[PDB]
Coordinates of C-alpha atoms (C1' of nucleotides) and ligand atoms in Angstrom, one line a residue:
Chain A
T1 CA -31.1 46.5 -126.2
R2 CA -28.9 44.2 -128.3
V3 CA -29.6 40.8 -130.1
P4 CA -26.7 38.2 -130.4
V5 CA -25.8 37.2 -133.9
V6 CA -24.3 33.7 -134.9
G7 CA -22.2 33.1 -138.2
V8 CA -22.4 30.3 -140.7
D9 CA -19.6 29.1 -139.9
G10 CA -20.8 28.9 -135.9
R11 CA -19.2 31.8 -134.5
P12 CA -20.8 34.2 -132.5
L13 CA -20.4 37.7 -134.4
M14 CA -21.0 41.4 -131.9
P15 CA -24.6 41.4 -130.9
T16 CA -26.7 44.2 -133.5
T17 CA -29.7 46.5 -133.1
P18 CA -33.2 45.1 -133.0
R19 CA -33.6 46.7 -135.7
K20 CA -31.0 45.2 -137.6
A21 CA -32.9 42.3 -136.5
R22 CA -35.8 43.0 -137.6
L23 CA -34.2 44.1 -141.4
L24 CA -31.7 40.9 -141.4
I25 CA -34.9 38.1 -141.1
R26 CA -37.7 40.4 -142.9
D27 CA -34.9 40.1 -146.0
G28 CA -34.5 36.5 -145.5
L29 CA -30.3 36.8 -144.8
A30 CA -30.8 35.7 -141.1
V31 CA -32.7 32.9 -139.3
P32 CA -34.8 34.0 -135.8
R33 CA -33.5 31.5 -133.4
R34 CA -33.9 30.9 -129.2
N35 CA -31.2 29.0 -127.4
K36 CA -31.9 26.3 -124.8
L37 CA -32.2 28.9 -121.7
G38 CA -34.0 31.0 -124.2
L39 CA -32.4 33.8 -124.9
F40 CA -33.0 35.0 -128.7
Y41 CA -30.6 35.0 -131.2
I42 CA -30.2 35.1 -134.8
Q43 CA -28.1 33.0 -137.0
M44 CA -27.1 34.3 -140.2
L45 CA -27.1 32.5 -143.7
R46 CA -24.2 35.0 -145.8
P47 CA -20.3 35.0 -144.7
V48 CA -20.0 38.5 -143.1
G49 CA -17.1 40.5 -140.9
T50 CA -15.4 38.6 -138.3
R51 CA -13.8 41.6 -136.0
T52 CA -15.1 41.7 -132.6
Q53 CA -14.4 43.5 -129.2
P54 CA -14.2 42.1 -125.9
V55 CA -16.5 40.9 -124.1
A56 CA -16.3 38.7 -120.7
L57 CA -18.7 36.2 -118.8
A58 CA -18.4 36.1 -114.3
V59 CA -19.7 33.6 -112.8
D60 CA -20.8 33.8 -108.8
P61 CA -21.3 30.3 -107.2
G62 CA -23.4 30.0 -105.1
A63 CA -25.3 26.8 -102.9
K64 CA -28.7 27.8 -103.5
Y65 CA -28.6 30.2 -106.7
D66 CA -25.4 31.2 -108.3
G67 CA -24.8 34.9 -110.2
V68 CA -23.8 35.4 -113.7
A69 CA -23.5 38.4 -115.9
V70 CA -21.9 39.4 -119.1
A71 CA -20.2 42.5 -120.0
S72 CA -18.5 44.1 -123.6
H73 CA -15.4 45.7 -122.6
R74 CA -17.4 49.5 -122.4
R75 CA -20.6 48.1 -120.4
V76 CA -22.7 45.0 -118.6
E77 CA -24.5 43.8 -121.1
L78 CA -26.5 41.0 -119.1
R79 CA -27.7 39.8 -115.3
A80 CA -28.5 36.7 -114.6
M81 CA -29.5 34.1 -111.9
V82 CA -29.5 30.1 -111.8
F83 CA -31.2 28.1 -109.2
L84 CA -29.9 24.8 -108.1
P85 CA -32.8 23.0 -105.8
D86 CA -30.5 20.4 -104.3
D87 CA -33.5 17.9 -104.6
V88 CA -30.9 15.5 -105.4
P89 CA -29.6 14.1 -101.7
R90 CA -33.7 13.3 -100.9
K91 CA -34.0 11.5 -103.8
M92 CA -31.0 9.1 -103.9
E93 CA -31.8 8.5 -100.0
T94 CA -35.6 7.2 -100.8
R95 CA -33.7 5.0 -103.5
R96 CA -31.1 3.6 -100.7
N97 CA -33.9 3.0 -98.0
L98 CA -36.2 1.5 -101.0
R99 CA -32.9 -0.7 -102.2
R100 CA -32.8 -1.8 -98.4
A101 CA -36.3 -3.0 -98.0
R102 CA -36.3 -4.9 -101.8
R103 CA -33.8 -6.9 -101.0
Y104 CA -34.5 -7.7 -96.9
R105 CA -37.6 -8.9 -98.5
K106 CA -36.7 -10.0 -101.9
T107 CA -32.6 -11.8 -101.9
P108 CA -31.4 -14.7 -99.8
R109 CA -28.5 -13.3 -97.2
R110 CA -25.3 -12.0 -99.5
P111 CA -21.9 -11.2 -98.9
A112 CA -20.6 -8.1 -97.4
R113 CA -18.4 -6.2 -99.9
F114 CA -16.9 -2.8 -99.1
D115 CA -13.0 -3.5 -98.3
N116 CA -11.8 -3.3 -102.4
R117 CA -14.3 -1.1 -103.9
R118 CA -11.8 0.9 -106.0
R119 CA -13.5 3.9 -108.0
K120 CA -11.6 4.6 -111.2
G121 CA -10.5 7.7 -112.2
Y122 CA -12.2 11.6 -111.0
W123 CA -15.5 10.7 -109.2
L124 CA -18.0 13.2 -107.8
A125 CA -21.6 12.0 -105.8
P126 CA -24.5 12.6 -108.2
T127 CA -25.2 15.9 -106.3
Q128 CA -22.1 17.2 -106.9
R129 CA -22.2 16.3 -110.8
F130 CA -25.6 17.8 -111.1
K131 CA -24.7 20.7 -109.7
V132 CA -21.4 21.2 -112.0
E133 CA -23.5 19.9 -115.5
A134 CA -26.2 22.5 -114.5
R135 CA -23.8 25.7 -114.2
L136 CA -20.9 23.9 -117.0
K137 CA -24.1 23.8 -119.3
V138 CA -25.0 27.3 -118.1
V139 CA -22.0 28.8 -119.6
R140 CA -21.5 27.2 -122.3
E141 CA -24.9 28.3 -123.4
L142 CA -24.3 31.9 -122.9
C143 CA -20.9 31.1 -125.2
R144 CA -22.2 29.6 -127.9
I145 CA -24.1 33.3 -128.5
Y146 CA -21.8 36.0 -127.0
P147 CA -17.7 36.1 -128.0
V148 CA -16.8 35.6 -124.5
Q149 CA -13.4 36.1 -124.0
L150 CA -12.5 35.9 -120.9
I151 CA -14.9 34.0 -117.5
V152 CA -14.2 35.1 -114.3
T153 CA -15.1 33.4 -110.9
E154 CA -14.5 33.7 -107.4
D155 CA -12.2 30.8 -105.9
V156 CA -14.1 30.1 -102.9
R157 CA -12.5 28.6 -99.8
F158 CA -14.0 27.8 -96.2
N159 CA -11.6 27.1 -93.2
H160 CA -13.4 23.3 -92.2
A161 CA -10.4 22.7 -89.6
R162 CA -11.6 25.6 -87.5
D163 CA -15.2 25.0 -88.2
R164 CA -17.6 22.4 -88.8
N165 CA -20.4 23.9 -89.7
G166 CA -19.0 24.5 -93.4
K167 CA -21.8 22.3 -95.6
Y168 CA -22.9 25.3 -97.6
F169 CA -19.3 25.8 -98.9
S170 CA -18.1 22.1 -99.4
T171 CA -21.5 21.7 -102.0
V172 CA -19.7 25.0 -104.3
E173 CA -15.7 23.4 -103.6
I174 CA -16.3 20.0 -104.2
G175 CA -16.3 19.4 -108.1
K176 CA -14.5 22.5 -108.9
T177 CA -11.4 21.4 -110.8
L178 CA -13.8 19.5 -113.5
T179 CA -15.1 23.4 -113.2
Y180 CA -12.2 25.0 -114.4
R181 CA -11.0 22.7 -116.3
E182 CA -13.8 22.7 -118.3
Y183 CA -14.1 26.0 -118.4
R184 CA -10.4 26.7 -119.4
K185 CA -11.4 25.1 -122.8
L186 CA -14.1 27.5 -123.6
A187 CA -12.1 30.8 -122.5
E188 CA -9.4 31.9 -121.2
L189 CA -10.0 31.8 -116.5
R190 CA -9.4 34.5 -114.2
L191 CA -10.0 33.4 -110.8
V192 CA -10.5 35.9 -107.7
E193 CA -10.6 36.2 -104.5
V194 CA -13.4 36.0 -101.6
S195 CA -11.7 39.9 -100.3
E196 CA -11.5 41.4 -103.8
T197 CA -15.1 40.6 -104.7
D198 CA -15.7 42.3 -101.3
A199 CA -13.3 44.9 -102.0
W200 CA -15.1 45.4 -105.6
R201 CA -18.3 45.5 -104.4
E202 CA -17.6 47.8 -101.9
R203 CA -15.5 50.2 -104.5
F204 CA -19.0 50.1 -106.8
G205 CA -21.8 49.8 -104.8
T206 CA -29.5 39.7 -106.2
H207 CA -26.5 38.6 -106.8
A208 CA -25.8 38.8 -110.2
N209 CA -24.9 42.2 -109.0
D210 CA -21.6 40.5 -107.1
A211 CA -21.0 38.9 -110.3
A212 CA -21.2 42.5 -112.5
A213 CA -19.3 43.4 -109.5
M214 CA -16.3 41.1 -110.5
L215 CA -16.9 42.1 -114.3
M216 CA -16.2 45.9 -113.4
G217 CA -13.3 44.7 -111.1
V218 CA -11.7 42.6 -114.2
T219 CA -12.4 45.0 -116.8
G220 CA -13.8 48.2 -115.6
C221 CA -16.3 48.2 -117.7
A222 CA -19.6 50.6 -117.1
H223 CA -22.5 49.4 -114.8
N224 CA -25.6 49.3 -116.6
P225 CA -28.9 49.5 -114.6
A226 CA -31.1 48.9 -117.7
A227 CA -28.9 45.7 -118.3
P228 CA -32.3 42.5 -118.4
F229 CA -32.0 40.7 -115.2
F230 CA -33.4 37.0 -116.4
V231 CA -34.2 34.0 -113.8
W232 CA -33.3 30.1 -115.0
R233 CA -33.5 27.1 -113.0
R234 CA -32.8 23.5 -114.4
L235 CA -35.9 21.7 -114.3
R236 CA -36.2 19.2 -111.9
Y237 CA -39.1 15.7 -112.2
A238 CA -39.9 12.0 -110.8
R239 CA -38.2 10.7 -114.5
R240 CA -38.1 6.4 -113.2
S241 CA -40.3 6.6 -110.5
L242 CA -43.2 5.2 -112.1
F243 CA -45.6 4.4 -109.6
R244 CA -46.0 5.2 -105.4
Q245 CA -44.7 3.3 -103.0
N246 CA -47.1 2.5 -100.0
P247 CA -49.6 0.4 -101.3
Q248 CA -53.3 2.2 -100.9
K249 CA -56.8 0.8 -100.1
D250 CA -57.7 -3.2 -102.2
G251 CA -53.6 -3.1 -102.5
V252 CA -53.6 -0.2 -105.2
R253 CA -50.2 1.6 -106.3
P254 CA -51.2 4.7 -108.3
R255 CA -48.8 5.8 -110.7
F256 CA -46.5 8.9 -110.0
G257 CA -43.2 9.9 -112.5
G258 CA -42.2 9.2 -115.9
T259 CA -40.9 11.8 -118.1
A260 CA -42.3 10.2 -121.3
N261 CA -45.6 7.8 -121.4
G262 CA -46.0 7.7 -125.9
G263 CA -48.1 11.2 -125.7
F264 CA -47.2 13.7 -128.2
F265 CA -46.1 16.1 -125.0
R266 CA -43.1 15.1 -123.0
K267 CA -42.2 17.0 -119.3
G268 CA -39.7 19.2 -120.1
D269 CA -41.0 20.7 -122.6
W270 CA -42.6 24.5 -123.6
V271 CA -45.6 25.1 -124.4
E272 CA -48.6 27.1 -124.6
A273 CA -52.3 26.6 -123.7
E274 CA -55.5 27.8 -123.5
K275 CA -57.8 27.4 -120.8
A276 CA -60.5 29.2 -119.1
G277 CA -59.9 31.8 -122.5
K278 CA -56.9 33.1 -121.6
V279 CA -53.5 31.7 -122.9
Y280 CA -50.8 30.5 -120.8
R281 CA -47.0 29.3 -122.1
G282 CA -45.2 26.9 -119.6
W283 CA -43.9 23.7 -119.0
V284 CA -45.2 20.2 -119.1
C285 CA -45.8 19.2 -115.6
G286 CA -47.5 16.3 -116.5
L287 CA -49.0 14.0 -119.3
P288 CA -52.1 12.5 -120.2
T289 CA -52.9 9.0 -118.9
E290 CA -56.0 7.1 -120.0
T291 CA -57.8 8.4 -117.3
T292 CA -56.0 12.0 -116.5
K293 CA -57.0 12.7 -120.2
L294 CA -55.1 16.5 -119.7
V295 CA -51.6 17.9 -119.9
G296 CA -50.5 19.5 -116.4
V297 CA -48.5 23.1 -117.0
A298 CA -46.3 24.8 -114.8
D299 CA -44.7 28.1 -114.7
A300 CA -41.2 29.5 -114.9
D301 CA -41.1 29.3 -111.4
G302 CA -42.3 24.9 -111.2
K303 CA -45.7 25.5 -109.5
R304 CA -48.5 24.2 -111.2
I305 CA -51.1 26.1 -112.9
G306 CA -52.8 23.6 -113.8
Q307 CA -54.5 20.9 -116.2
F308 CA -55.2 21.4 -119.9
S309 CA -57.2 20.0 -122.6
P310 CA -55.2 18.2 -124.9
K311 CA -56.7 19.9 -127.7
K312 CA -55.7 23.3 -126.1
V313 CA -52.2 23.0 -125.6
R314 CA -49.1 23.8 -128.5
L315 CA -46.0 22.5 -128.4
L316 CA -43.3 25.3 -128.7
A317 CA -39.7 23.9 -127.8
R318 CA -39.5 20.2 -126.8
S319 CA -37.3 20.4 -123.5
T320 CA -34.2 22.2 -123.0
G321 CA -33.6 21.2 -119.2
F322 CA -34.0 25.3 -118.3
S323 CA -37.4 27.3 -117.6
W324 CA -36.6 30.8 -118.1
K325 CA -38.0 34.3 -116.7
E326 CA -37.4 37.7 -117.3
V327 CA -37.8 40.0 -115.0
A328 CA -39.8 43.3 -115.7
Chain B
rC1 C1' 3.9 16.4 -105.5
rU2 C1' 3.9 11.6 -101.7
rU3 C1' 1.8 9.7 -97.6
rA4 C1' -0.7 11.1 -92.4
rU5 C1' -4.1 14.2 -88.8
rU6 C1' -9.0 17.1 -88.3
rA7 C1' -13.3 18.9 -90.4
rA8 C1' -17.3 19.0 -94.3
rA9 C1' -19.9 16.5 -98.5
rU10 C1' -22.5 12.4 -100.2
rG11 C1' -21.9 7.5 -103.3
rA12 C1' -21.1 1.6 -101.8
rC13 C1' -22.2 -2.9 -99.5
rU14 C1' -24.4 -5.8 -95.3
rU15 C1' -27.5 -6.9 -90.9
rC16 C1' -31.5 -6.1 -88.2
rU17 C1' -36.4 -3.6 -89.2
rC18 C1' -39.7 0.0 -88.9
rG19 C1' -43.9 1.5 -92.4
rU20 C1' -48.4 0.4 -96.1
rC21 C1' -51.8 -3.0 -98.0
rA22 C1' -54.9 -8.1 -98.1
rA23 C1' -56.3 -12.8 -97.5
rC24 C1' -57.5 -16.9 -93.5
rC25 C1' -57.4 -19.2 -89.1
rA26 C1' -57.7 -18.8 -82.9
rC27 C1' -59.3 -15.6 -78.9
rC28 C1' -62.6 -11.7 -76.4
rC29 C1' -66.4 -7.6 -76.3
rC30 C1' -71.4 -4.7 -78.1
rU31 C1' -75.7 -5.3 -80.3
rG32 C1' -79.6 -8.9 -83.2
rA33 C1' -83.4 -13.4 -84.6
rC34 C1' -84.3 -18.2 -82.1
rG35 C1' -76.1 -21.9 -76.1
rU36 C1' -77.1 -21.9 -82.3
rU37 C1' -76.4 -18.1 -85.5
rG38 C1' -75.6 -12.7 -87.8
rG39 C1' -73.5 -6.9 -88.0
rG40 C1' -69.2 -4.6 -86.2
rG41 C1' -64.9 -4.2 -83.4
rG42 C1' -60.7 -5.9 -80.3
rC43 C1' -57.4 1.2 -82.0
rC44 C1' -53.3 5.0 -80.8
rC45 C1' -49.5 8.3 -78.3
rG46 C1' -45.8 8.7 -74.5
rG47 C1' -42.1 6.8 -71.1
rU48 C1' -39.0 2.8 -69.4
rU49 C1' -35.5 -2.1 -69.5
rU50 C1' -29.9 -1.4 -73.3
rG51 C1' -23.6 1.8 -75.8
rG52 C1' -27.4 1.1 -79.7
rC53 C1' -31.8 -0.2 -82.7
rG54 C1' -36.0 -3.5 -83.6
rG55 C1' -39.4 -7.0 -81.1
rG56 C1' -41.0 -8.4 -75.6
rG57 C1' -42.3 -7.4 -70.2
rC58 C1' -43.9 -2.7 -67.3
rC59 C1' -45.8 2.4 -66.0
rG60 C1' -48.9 6.7 -67.8
rG61 C1' -51.8 9.1 -71.0
rG62 C1' -55.7 9.7 -75.1
rG63 C1' -60.1 8.7 -78.1
rG64 C1' -63.8 4.8 -77.3
rC65 C1' -67.2 3.8 -73.6
rA66 C1' -66.6 -2.2 -75.2
rA67 C1' -62.4 -4.8 -72.3
rC68 C1' -58.7 -4.0 -75.5
rU69 C1' -55.2 -9.7 -78.6
rG70 C1' -52.6 -13.9 -80.7
rG71 C1' -51.4 -17.5 -85.5
rC72 C1' -49.7 -18.1 -90.5
rU73 C1' -49.6 -16.8 -95.7
rG74 C1' -48.9 -13.6 -100.0
rA75 C1' -48.0 -8.0 -101.8
rC76 C1' -44.7 -2.2 -101.9
rC77 C1' -41.8 0.1 -108.5
rA78 C1' -43.5 -1.0 -114.1
rG79 C1' -41.1 -5.1 -115.5
rG80 C1' -35.9 -7.3 -118.0
rC81 C1' -32.6 -11.1 -117.8
rG82 C1' -29.6 -15.5 -116.6
rG83 C1' -29.5 -21.5 -114.7
rC84 C1' -32.2 -26.2 -115.3
rC85 C1' -36.3 -28.7 -116.4
rC86 C1' -41.1 -30.0 -119.6
rG87 C1' -43.4 -29.7 -124.6
rG88 C1' -43.8 -28.4 -129.8
rC89 C1' -36.9 -20.0 -130.9
rC90 C1' -42.5 -19.3 -129.0
rG91 C1' -45.8 -21.5 -124.5
rG92 C1' -45.5 -23.4 -119.5
rG93 C1' -42.6 -23.8 -114.9
rC94 C1' -38.6 -24.6 -110.0
rA95 C1' -37.5 -30.6 -109.9
rG96 C1' -32.4 -30.8 -109.5
rG97 C1' -27.7 -28.1 -108.6
rG98 C1' -25.9 -23.5 -106.7
rG99 C1' -25.1 -18.2 -102.9
rU100 C1' -23.8 -16.4 -98.0
rC101 C1' -23.0 -16.3 -92.3
rC102 C1' -21.9 -19.5 -87.8
rG103 C1' -20.4 -23.6 -84.6
rC104 C1' -16.4 -27.8 -84.5
rG105 C1' -12.5 -30.2 -87.2
rG106 C1' -9.1 -31.4 -91.2
rG107 C1' -5.4 -31.3 -95.6
rG108 C1' -2.0 -28.5 -98.4
rC109 C1' 1.2 -23.3 -98.0
rU110 C1' 3.4 -19.3 -96.4
rA111 C1' 6.3 -14.6 -93.8
rC112 C1' 4.6 -9.3 -98.2
rC113 C1' 7.5 -9.2 -106.5
rA114 C1' 4.4 -13.8 -99.4
rA115 C1' 0.9 -18.2 -99.9
rG116 C1' -4.0 -17.5 -104.1
rG117 C1' -7.9 -16.0 -104.5
rA118 C1' -11.1 -11.7 -105.7
rC119 C1' -15.8 -5.9 -104.0
rU120 C1' -7.7 -6.0 -108.2
rU121 C1' -6.6 -5.4 -113.8
rC122 C1' -8.0 -6.4 -119.3
rC123 C1' -12.3 -7.3 -121.9
rG124 C1' -17.0 -8.7 -122.5
rG125 C1' -22.3 -9.0 -120.9
rG126 C1' -27.4 -8.9 -117.9
rU127 C1' -30.2 -4.2 -115.3
rG128 C1' -31.2 1.3 -115.6
rU129 C1' -39.0 6.0 -117.6
rU130 C1' -38.2 6.6 -123.0
rU131 C1' -39.5 9.2 -129.0
rC132 C1' -33.8 8.0 -129.8
rG133 C1' -29.0 8.2 -127.4
rC134 C1' -25.6 8.6 -123.1
rC135 C1' -23.7 7.7 -117.8
rA136 C1' -23.7 6.9 -112.5
rG137 C1' -24.5 2.3 -109.3
rC138 C1' -25.1 -3.0 -108.5
rC139 C1' -24.5 -7.5 -110.4
rC140 C1' -22.1 -11.7 -113.6
rG141 C1' -18.6 -14.1 -116.9
rG142 C1' -13.4 -15.4 -119.4
rA143 C1' -8.4 -14.3 -119.4
rC144 C1' -3.8 -13.9 -116.8
rU145 C1' -2.1 -12.4 -111.1
rA146 C1' -2.5 -6.1 -114.4
rU147 C1' 3.0 -1.2 -113.2
rC148 C1' 0.4 -3.4 -106.5
rU149 C1' -5.5 -3.0 -105.2
rC150 C1' -7.2 -6.3 -100.9
rC151 C1' -7.1 -9.7 -96.8
rG152 C1' -8.4 -11.7 -88.4
rG153 C1' -10.4 -12.8 -83.4
rC154 C1' -12.1 -12.3 -78.0
rA155 C1' -14.7 -9.0 -74.0
rG156 C1' -17.8 -5.2 -72.7
rA157 C1' -23.1 -8.2 -74.2
rA158 C1' -28.2 -8.1 -72.0
rC159 C1' -35.3 -10.2 -71.4
rC160 C1' -34.4 -12.0 -76.9
rG161 C1' -32.4 -10.8 -82.3
rC162 C1' -28.3 -7.6 -84.6
rU163 C1' -24.1 -4.9 -84.3
rC164 C1' -15.4 -4.1 -84.9
rA165 C1' -20.5 1.2 -79.2
rA166 C1' -17.2 3.9 -75.7
rU167 C1' -13.2 0.9 -73.8
rG168 C1' -9.6 -3.5 -72.7
rC169 C1' -7.0 -7.8 -74.7
rC170 C1' -4.9 -11.2 -78.3
rG171 C1' -2.8 -11.7 -83.8
rC172 C1' -0.1 -9.1 -88.1
rG173 C1' 5.8 -13.9 -86.6
rG174 C1' 9.8 -16.8 -84.2
rC175 C1' 15.0 -19.0 -84.0
rC176 C1' 18.9 -19.1 -86.0
rG177 C1' 23.5 -18.1 -88.9
rC178 C1' 21.5 -10.8 -95.7
rG179 C1' 20.0 -15.9 -96.2
rG180 C1' 18.5 -20.6 -93.8
rC181 C1' 14.5 -23.8 -91.3
rC182 C1' 9.9 -23.6 -88.5
rU183 C1' 4.4 -22.2 -88.0
rA184 C1' 0.3 -19.6 -87.7
rA185 C1' -5.6 -16.6 -85.0
rG186 C1' -3.1 -15.0 -92.8
rC187 C1' -3.6 -17.7 -97.9
rC188 C1' -6.0 -21.6 -101.0
rC189 C1' -9.3 -26.2 -100.2
rU190 C1' -12.6 -29.2 -97.6
rG191 C1' -15.7 -33.1 -93.6
rC192 C1' -20.7 -33.0 -90.0
rG193 C1' -24.3 -29.7 -88.0
rG194 C1' -27.3 -24.6 -88.1
rA195 C1' -29.1 -19.7 -89.5
rC196 C1' -31.5 -16.9 -94.0
rA197 C1' -33.6 -18.4 -98.9
rG198 C1' -36.9 -21.2 -101.3
rC199 C1' -33.2 -21.5 -108.0
rG200 C1' -30.6 -16.7 -109.2
rC201 C1' -29.3 -10.6 -110.6
rC202 C1' -30.8 -5.9 -111.6
rG203 C1' -35.3 -2.3 -111.4
rA204 C1' -37.8 4.0 -107.2
rG205 C1' -30.5 8.1 -109.9
rG206 C1' -28.2 12.4 -113.5
rC207 C1' -27.9 14.0 -118.8
rG208 C1' -27.5 15.3 -124.3
rA209 C1' -30.3 15.9 -128.9
rC210 C1' -35.5 17.5 -130.8
rA211 C1' -37.0 24.7 -135.1
rA212 C1' -43.4 22.9 -133.5
rU213 C1' -39.6 28.3 -130.3
rC214 C1' -39.9 34.6 -135.5
rA215 C1' -38.4 37.9 -130.4
rC216 C1' -37.5 44.1 -128.3
rU217 C1' -39.8 48.6 -128.4
rC218 C1' -43.6 52.7 -131.2
rC219 C1' -47.3 54.1 -134.8
rG220 C1' -52.0 52.6 -137.3
rG221 C1' -48.7 47.5 -142.8
rG222 C1' -44.8 50.6 -141.4
rA223 C1' -41.0 53.5 -138.2
rG224 C1' -36.2 52.6 -134.4
rG225 C1' -28.1 55.2 -139.2
rC226 C1' -25.4 55.2 -144.2
rC227 C1' -20.6 53.0 -144.9
rG228 C1' -15.9 49.3 -144.0
rU229 C1' -18.2 41.4 -147.1
rG230 C1' -25.9 44.7 -144.8
rU231 C1' -22.3 41.4 -137.7
rA232 C1' -19.5 45.8 -134.6
rU233 C1' -19.7 49.1 -128.0
rC234 C1' -14.2 49.0 -133.6
rG235 C1' -12.8 53.0 -138.0
rG236 C1' -15.5 57.1 -141.5
rC237 C1' -17.6 61.4 -142.0
Chain C
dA1 C1' -70.7 15.6 -122.9
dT2 C1' -66.5 17.7 -121.5
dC3 C1' -64.8 22.0 -119.3
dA4 C1' -62.8 24.6 -115.1
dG5 C1' -62.3 25.3 -109.9
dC6 C1' -60.8 22.9 -106.1
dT7 C1' -59.5 19.1 -103.3
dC8 C1' -56.3 15.1 -101.4
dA9 C1' -52.1 12.2 -100.1
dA10 C1' -47.7 11.3 -100.7
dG11 C1' -42.5 5.6 -97.1
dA12 C1' -38.2 5.8 -93.3
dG13 C1' -34.4 4.3 -89.8
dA14 C1' -29.9 2.6 -86.4
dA15 C1' -25.5 0.3 -86.6
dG16 C1' -20.4 -2.3 -88.8
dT17 C1' -16.8 -0.8 -92.9
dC18 C1' -15.2 0.9 -96.9
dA19 C1' -14.8 4.9 -100.9
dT20 C1' -14.0 10.5 -103.7
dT21 C1' -13.3 15.5 -103.6
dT22 C1' -11.9 20.3 -101.0
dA23 C1' -10.1 23.0 -97.3
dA24 C1' -6.1 23.8 -93.3
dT25 C1' -1.9 22.1 -91.2
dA26 C1' 1.7 18.1 -90.8
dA27 C1' 6.2 15.3 -92.1
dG28 C1' 8.8 13.9 -96.3
Chain D
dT1 C1' -44.4 16.1 -107.0
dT2 C1' -48.1 14.3 -109.6
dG3 C1' -52.7 11.7 -110.8
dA4 C1' -56.8 11.3 -109.9
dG5 C1' -61.5 12.1 -107.5
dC6 C1' -66.1 15.4 -107.1
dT7 C1' -68.6 19.0 -108.2
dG8 C1' -70.8 23.0 -110.6
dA9 C1' -71.3 25.1 -114.9
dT10 C1' -73.1 25.0 -120.3
Ligands
MG401 MG1 -35.6 0.3 -120.0
MG402 MG1 -14.6 -0.2 -80.1

RNA sequence: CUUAUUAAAUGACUUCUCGUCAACCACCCCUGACGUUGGGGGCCCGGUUUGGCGGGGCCGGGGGCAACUGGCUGACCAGGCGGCCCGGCCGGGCAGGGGUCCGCGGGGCUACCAAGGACUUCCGGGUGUUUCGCCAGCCCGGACUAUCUCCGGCAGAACCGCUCAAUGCCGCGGCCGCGGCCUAAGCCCUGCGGACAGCGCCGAGGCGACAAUCACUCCGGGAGGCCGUGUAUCGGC
DNA sequence: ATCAGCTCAAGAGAAGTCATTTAATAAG
DNA sequence: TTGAGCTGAT
């Protein structure tokens, strides 16, 4: 196991051992820290030598989930898996339907204006902006704590003109130029063909393994089966839909969404909670209200653990946007 | 790299409307005290007529066992903002004057650096869970008309409403000698009648930050290399 | 008097037109 | 995807 180290100037250093991590914290020379992805690291409180060896990052994008791996010049140091749960198209469809009904029943007749709705600069649909921004944040937060010098990614391609079914390629092809533009600001980029990915996978023998095979290809590092495996997913909430849509008996509409409501906790926050004499660490599914004076907490995969008394919940970290999960 | 063809992804405007909830009126049915009056119900699902969607009229079945419906009004983010009015920037409010589409008609103009506006361009504003902050989308104002972006109609077409359905037809110029004259189904303005609204616009979308984040093994507070600035997988024994 | 376990319901669609980004191919 | 209702228990 290795602990990432970050210098007083904000550069990543080379990773150190857990023993050095312990003693640097104990002696007060460095502060322990967690990344936005929850990865533990240490920030120095002293200048130290800045010499580092090569480190490379690989990202193998999928539609539903991605593989990520980090390798030193010697070995793979990390494997990870990233989930993006495809929530935005339904949310935009429901918002569109509600807008259409609202305008129908609440506005006069209005002119149809569709001929000249020009778009200025580069454009992406909200779903593709969502997935690009998530993948960029993952990469950008990995490059924050590791001395990444090279980014490796497969350049997905599909012949849409000859096969109509290609949905799960379109969702990853679209937005690639913005991704590649943003990648090159972090580190030098090596694009990889799908055939090269296949060849390296078959040579060396969870899709983080495929991203690791792209590393073993480009940089020749050894495989590391003992490397830790992490699961990360973007947190999803009902951000502005404050109430349920259909009026129920006597015309009531129950409240639904909102990430903040003037309380202490907020839905993205990471918390430790007690219930039935047992301790849980999780993320705030639900907020206290005048009637429902409980905090809903969910596990790393987004399923609610339960509802908790607000006295028994301790705030660990405010919303990072991600959950995290180490796989034993 | 410009333009085009095919195919995916998912964003916008508009029309038509389902779905949910609530109140009142009219009619019908079961049942109760003695036609007056009182409790409750009058519901669903599938098929069909159309190019298609929603009403309506038919066909059939379920579930009740009681046969099986009309009219009309209000609500579906919380709220925010603009126009104008009344009282004294706070309180209350929608009278006036605006917005769009359709039918018939008129005035001025022009043939693509068009007619001359704006879903063009530039600047700015409203809205957009919030602890703070940013963005997408929509809408609006002023300044020009921006290094150029955009501007139509008929049939099919009906039991009704809407719709550029598949398809078919027209206009996107004509005439003369690059230039000139003329003229629209194109551009600007506008009259009378009808439709939507009852004063309008935006509200169910994406995200950043937060030090409360103190780890990993292993013993029973400590251990899990010393040095090259107490980083290092690189170098040194 | 309040903690914990278990349960419940939850808005959706046709059509006209238009617009980006990413393929494979044209033609310049 | 999340607030809220209901019950049993101490
Ligand atoms: Mg707000
Ligand atoms: Mg047609």
